[PDB]
Amino acid sequence: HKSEVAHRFKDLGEENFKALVLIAFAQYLQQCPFEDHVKLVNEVTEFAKTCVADESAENCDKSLHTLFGDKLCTVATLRETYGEMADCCAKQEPERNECFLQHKDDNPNLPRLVRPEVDVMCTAFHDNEETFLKKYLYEIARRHPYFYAPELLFFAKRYKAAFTECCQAADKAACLLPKLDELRDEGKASSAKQRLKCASLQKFGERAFKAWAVARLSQRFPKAEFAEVSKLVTDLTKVHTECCHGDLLECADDRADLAKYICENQDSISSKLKECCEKPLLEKSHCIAEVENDEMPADLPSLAADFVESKDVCKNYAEAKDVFLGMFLYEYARRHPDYSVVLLLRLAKTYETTLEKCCAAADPHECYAKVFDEFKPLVEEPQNLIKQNCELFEQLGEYKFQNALLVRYTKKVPQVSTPTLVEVSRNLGKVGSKCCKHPEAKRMPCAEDYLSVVLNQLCVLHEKTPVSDRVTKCCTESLVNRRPCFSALEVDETYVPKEFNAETFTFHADICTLSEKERQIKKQTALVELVKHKPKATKEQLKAVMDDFAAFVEKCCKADDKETCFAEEGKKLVAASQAALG
Ligand SMILES: CCCCCCCC/C=C\CCCCCCCC(=O)O
Ligand SMILES: CCCCCCCC/C=C\CCCCCCCC(=O)O
Ligand SMILES: CCCCCCCC/C=C\CCCCCCCC(=O)O
Ligand SMILES: CCCCCCCC/C=C\CCCCCCCC(=O)O
Numbered sequence: 001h002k003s004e005v006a007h008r009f010k011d012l013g014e015e016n017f018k019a020l021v022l023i024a025f026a027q028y029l030q031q032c033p034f035e036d037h038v039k040l041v042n043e044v045t046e047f048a049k050t051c052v053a054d055e056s057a058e059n060c061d062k063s064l065h066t067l068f069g070d071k072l073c074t075v076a077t078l079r080e081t082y083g084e085m086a087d088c089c090a091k092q093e094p095e096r097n098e099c100f101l102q103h104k105d106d107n108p109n110l111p112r113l114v115r116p117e118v119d120v121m122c123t124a125f126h127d128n129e130e131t132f133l134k135k136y137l138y139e140i141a142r143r144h145p146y147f148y149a150p151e152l153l154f155f156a157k158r159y160k161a162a163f164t165e166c167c168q169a170a171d172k173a174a175c176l177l178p179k180l181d182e183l184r185d186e187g188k189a190s191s192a193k194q195r196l197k198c199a200s201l202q203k204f205g206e207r208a209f210k211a212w213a214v215a216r217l218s219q220r221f222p223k224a225e226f227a228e229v230s231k232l233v234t235d236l237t238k239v240h241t242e243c244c245h246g247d248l249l250e251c252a253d254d255r256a257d258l259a260k261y262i263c264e265n266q267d268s269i270s271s272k273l274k275e276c277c278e279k280p281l282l283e284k285s286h287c288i289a290e291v292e293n294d295e296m297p298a299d300l301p302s303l304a305a306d307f308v309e310s311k312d313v314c315k316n317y318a319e320a321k322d323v324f325l326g327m328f329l330y331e332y333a334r335r336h337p338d339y340s341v342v343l344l345l346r347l348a349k350t351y352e353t354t355l356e357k358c359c360a361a362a363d364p365h366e367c368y369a370k371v372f373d374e375f376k377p378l379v380e381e382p383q384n385l386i387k388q389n390c391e392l393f394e395q396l397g398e399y400k401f402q403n404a405l406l407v408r409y410t411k412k413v414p415q416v417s418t419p420t421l422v423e424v425s426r427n428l429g430k431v432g433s434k435c436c437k438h439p440e441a442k443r444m445p446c447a448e449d450y451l452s453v454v455l456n457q458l459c460v461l462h463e464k465t466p467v468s469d470r471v472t473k474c475c476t477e478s479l480v481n482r483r484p485c486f487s488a489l490e491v492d493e494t495y496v497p498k499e500f501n502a503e504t505f506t507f508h509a510d511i512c513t514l515s516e517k518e519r520q521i522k523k524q525t526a527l528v529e530l531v532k533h534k535p536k537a538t539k540e541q542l543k544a545v546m547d548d549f550a551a552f553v554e555k556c557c558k559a560d561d562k563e564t565c566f567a568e569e570g571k572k573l574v575a576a577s578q579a580a581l582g
Contacts, residue, residue, distance in 0.1 A: 003060040005067060006051040011281045016153065018045050022134060023149045024248055026141035028072060028100060030108055031081055034138050044071060064249050065097050072100065101246045104145050113139055118176050122167035133160055146198075147191060149248055150282055155187055185430070192453040198244035199456070204479055207322070210237055214326050215333040215344040219445075221270045222296040222334035228268060229330055230323075235261070259285035270294035293337045303331055307351070308371055314359035325352055338441040339379070340448035345480050346378050385487065386443050390436035393429075399520060402429035406524060407542060410531040414495040415467045418528045422521060427454050455482055491535075498532045505529070505574055509562030511553065523549075534581045545577050 009017050021041050029037070044067075051060035059067065072078075072089075079086030088099035113136075116124075124132045137156050141147070162183070166175035201209050213233040221229065235258050243251035262269060263277035263284070272294045276287035307313065307328055317324045329348045336344065351371060358367035393401045406425040410416070431454065435446035459475035466472060474485035505526060511519050530545065531537070537545075552573050556565040 003051045003055045003057075004062075004064045005048045005060060006055055008064070009048045009052055014045070016282055017048065019134070019137065019153055019156070020149055021045065022138060023141040023152055024068070025072075026138045027145040027147075027149075027248070028104060029075065029082075030105060030110075030142040030145065032075070032077070034135055036075075037138060038134070040071065066093060068249070069093070069096050069100070097247070104246055106146055108143060108145075110143055113143070115180070118173040122163065122172055122176070125163045125167055129160075129163075144191060146194065146246060148194070148243065148251065150252065151190065151286060154283065154286060155183065155190075158183060189450070189453055192457055196453055196456045197240060199460075200479055201240055201244055206237060206241075208479065209240070210234075211326070211329065211345055211348065212341055213237065214329045215341045215348075218330045218333035219337045219339075219341075220291065220293050222337070223271070223294055224269045226327055226330050228265070230326065232258075232262070232269075255285040256281060259288050262288060296334060296337075300335060303335070304372060306331070308369065311365050313368070314355065314364050317355050317359060321352075338444060340382065340444040342448060342480050342483070343379065343382055343444065347375050349480065350374055350378065381484070381487075382444055382447075386447060389432060390443070393432040393436045398429050398433050401432055402426050403524065403527060403546075405429060406527055407531055407539070410528050411491045411535055412489040413468055413471060414492050414532050414535060418525055418532070420461070421528050422524050424454070424458065425524070451483060455486065495535060497535060498529075500533060500578075501529075502574070504533075507553075507566055507570055509557070509566050512557035512562060537581050541581055545580060548573055548577065 012020065018041055021044050022037060025032075025037050025040055047059070050057045054060070062070075078089070082103070085100065085103040088096050088103065091099055115121075133156060136159075137152070141149075141152060144152070159180075162176065162179045166172055166179070169175040200212075210233050213236050214229060217224075217229050217232055217236070221232075224232075235254075239251070239254045239258055242254055245251075259276075263273065266273050266277055270291070272292050273288065276284060276291060279287050325348060328351055329344060332347060333339070333341075333344050354368050354371050354374070358364050361367050392404060395401075396404065402425050405428050406421065409425060410421050431447060431450040434450065435443055438446050459471075462468075462471050462475055470489060474482060474489070477485055507526075511522055514522065526549075527546070531542070552569060556562060556569055559565045
């Protein structure tokens with residue numbers, strides 16, 4: 001039917017097509033020059049215009065993969081540069097393309113991208129703003145070959161809108177930097193979420209994934225019927241598999257097909273989809289995936305009815321276990337948008353466990369009559385933690401809240417690197433700052449969202465440089481008990497204090513010229529070292545030492561001649577503190 005290129009070109013528009021072709025090629029030819037890819041893009045774009053003018057034009061009939069594959073193999077250096085990958089050009093289609101996906105190197109050997117000065121950046125932006133955005137688009141795409149292209153394009157437009165609104169302000173840095181930080185964090189989270197979902201699919205199986213998807217979908221579309229939700233879980237599962245495989249083209253088609261489906265049965269799924277279903281092809285699925293929870297019917301029976309009281313349960317269960325259990329989740333999840341998905345799964349595993357013990361006993365109904373009774377504690381566990389932690393967060397504020405976490409975790413896993421403990425504690429604080437501003441009904445979902453990517457990054461790291469069997473236990477265990485296992489970590493009684501070191505607790509006046517972020521990291525780094533040296537110190541002994549240090553920095557940063565007060569009063573602080581911490 002017609003021409004694929006022409007079609008995609010008409011749907012996307014020239015501007016989007018060119019930016020997407022750039023990203024796609026950058027993700028395969030990660031080592032080729034920018035000017036080389038631009039040549040490529042122009043060539044393909046010109047070809048695509050040929051097809052838009054005449055569908056019968058040469059090669060215009062060819063499939064996207066084939067056209068794409070032919071273009072890659074057309075690169076001169078290829079073998080000289082990539083070597084192995086060049087041998088892919090010797091194969092037929094299904095093979096050739098699969099051969100390229102295998103050589104798509106994740107975690108390249110490229111330099112870190114350094115953020116330029118707001119001024120140089122803004123000035124480059126005013127000059128060729130297009131080549132300014134494409135170069136960076138190219139730089140980020142080659143470093144993240146797995147990042148879904150259209151999404152990367154959505155972030156790029158937000159960056160563009162920020163340079164536009166900021167490069168014209170009185171104080172540019174004041175405007176730009178703050179939003180460049182939000183975008184970075186946002187981009188890293190999305191990137192991590194993505195690897196997280198794919199790793200989970202791989203590590204735990206499609207069953208676990210389907211369970212997660214049912215719960216998640218039911219919270220969002222509480223009005224949808226179970227048959228509808230199972231339909232979506234199935235398709236959603238096929239989408240994640242191919243999108244994880246890395247094949248951009250297949251992934252995009254599956255996503256478009258799904259969003260189209262959902263939009264066509266809009267009224268049969270959710271009322272909060274109107275906006276998203278009006279958007280262009282490029283942003284539909286992305287919009288839908290971010291859509292807000294629809295409101296629940298209000299005309300819903302009780303869970304006790306069909307799952308706890310009604311005999312006919314084991315019968316209905318033995319008939320199709322997973323389906324029955326899926327029904328339980330659907331029912332429980334659409335009634336609880338306020339629960340995290342993992343909590344929902346813990347309740348479902350608990351219920352499964354019960355049906356599996358009771359349905360085989362003499363009087364079934366009398367064995368599982370009090371099951372909802374066993375849910376209470378599972379539910380209270382996270383709620384209580386969130387309540388306790390957000391109260392504390394509101395008490396001391398972000399920075400001081402980060403310190404509280406710092407002391408807490410260093411004490412639980414002293415074997416961890418100081419820079420890693422600092423990074424972890426800081427990220428956790430931002431979660432507290434993002435999620436505690438929410439009402440009690442949106443807090444667990446918020447925390448789950450952020451905590452999962454933080455806990456995963458943590459584990460992949462530990463997977464590389466192991467440090468504690470305890471961490472490994474929590475990291476390799478069930479994805480449903482991952483967080484509870486970390487919450488259960490106890491202070492490390494075993495650990496042996498790190499012998500004193502003055503260099504470690506030696507401060508200089510430079511901490512006064514430092515920026516807010518740099519001196520925090522400076523102080524926090526020391527705080528971790530302090531706890532690693534005297535792990536048996538009280539929250540109070542520590543508060544006292546931290547207070548003595550506070551005034552220290554003050555009565556020395558505001559003193560005539562610094563680098564001395566710092567060595568004089570410093571010697572004192574350390575000698576006195578050593579005594580306090582007996
Ligand atoms: C991990 C991918 C998510 C990040 C999205 C990036 C989108 C790229 C679009 C335009 C380039 C912006 C140029 C500014 C670079 C500064 C990057 C940084 O702060 O780390
Ligand atoms: C509102 C979230 C509060 C975030 C504060 C950051 C401190 C992290 C420590 C404990 C938070 C525990 C939250 C547990 C909910 C995750 C979902 C789950 O496991 O059910
Ligand atoms: C040397 C680097 C290797 C990686 C080491 C991993 C370090 C883990 C450090 C701290 C654990 C994070 C705390 C997890 C949140 C649990 C929530 C709670 O407190 O209830
Ligand atoms: C027995 C070991 C003695 C070590 C010497 C102690 C010197 C003090 C060292 C580190 C304190 C770190 C400061 C953390 C509090 C930051 C709070 C704030 O910003 O005001």
